Symmetry: C2
Subunit: 190 residues, 2 copies
Amino acid sequence: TTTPTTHHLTIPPGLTQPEFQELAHSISEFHTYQVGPGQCSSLLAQRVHAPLPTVWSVVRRFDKPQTYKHFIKSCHVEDGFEMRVGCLRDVNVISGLPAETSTERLDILDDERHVTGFSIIGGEHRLRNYRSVTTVHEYQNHGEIWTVVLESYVVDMPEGNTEEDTRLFADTVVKLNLQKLASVTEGMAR
Amino acid sequence: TTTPTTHHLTIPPGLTQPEFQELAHSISEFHTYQVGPGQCSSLLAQRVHAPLPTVWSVVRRFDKPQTYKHFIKSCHVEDGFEMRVGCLRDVNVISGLPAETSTERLDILDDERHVTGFSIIGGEHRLRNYRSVTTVHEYQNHGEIWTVVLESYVVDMPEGNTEEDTRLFADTVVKLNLQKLASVTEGMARDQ
């Protein structure tokens, strides 16, 4: 009943067959979670027609998630802020209800392998123990080069929610943010 | 006591002044709301590079809001469903909350003037007493023709929310839905 996710065995929506083949080892390396009862996890993918550094330059800005995410009113980092593993950010999210600032922790930041990740340690009460990972990759199709962004998460389902509904919400939000990420970065690359 | 919105006095973001000249009359005719305390209102615009009938044909399908809106799991209408003013739809919303369903009422449907509108009569915790209006318009400049969609709303701010935060939420949903509407309809027209 507690088993590793299998995101590396299913073509995620947003990828083609060749893209997925070339990326499955990275999916198993960076986008694997332990899912038990009362947890769910998902992988989303987005093609981005901008150079990988341009795309990574946004993905890595732990202090400015609003650069590519919707529903962010503001994001503040701490005084002695160095974008280093463990630093905390307070994200005020636009939810339509009055909400508590979301306290998030930088879990991973690898400028050579283009991997970052975070976990929500305070604020969001319903989607508890959210932890997410983003990787950025370059891909080739008969000479044509583009960037692929993979974002996954694991979360505890609130008592009284199904896996299908919790995943539907988190997937919908991630998918919209990845759309914004592509628009923002393809414009920077023009 | 309420006061009127004056959305016809502001160029909606993304539109130009000549577009606005042609549309200001429609904003005051169809997009004027009475705003009291604890309510706020907004008008959004989306340029669409597809024929007006293609855009209107999607916007008018009160029974299929998921064709152009995000965050809808499904939409249920009654069996012998008739799309006439007063008809009801039940929108099961993707919220992360359990079984949120918005019962919405068709307020307006004018296939000659391309105006539709609805209000939420129960079930949406974020958008209480939401009432919205969409108009679709044609425009031509130096020969080039495109469609302009205007969507506005009025909504109650939940107790403990500012108008700024309530409009930020509702504006974001509207603008993302208008983005989807444009993608959906520009794709239908390229397949033509």
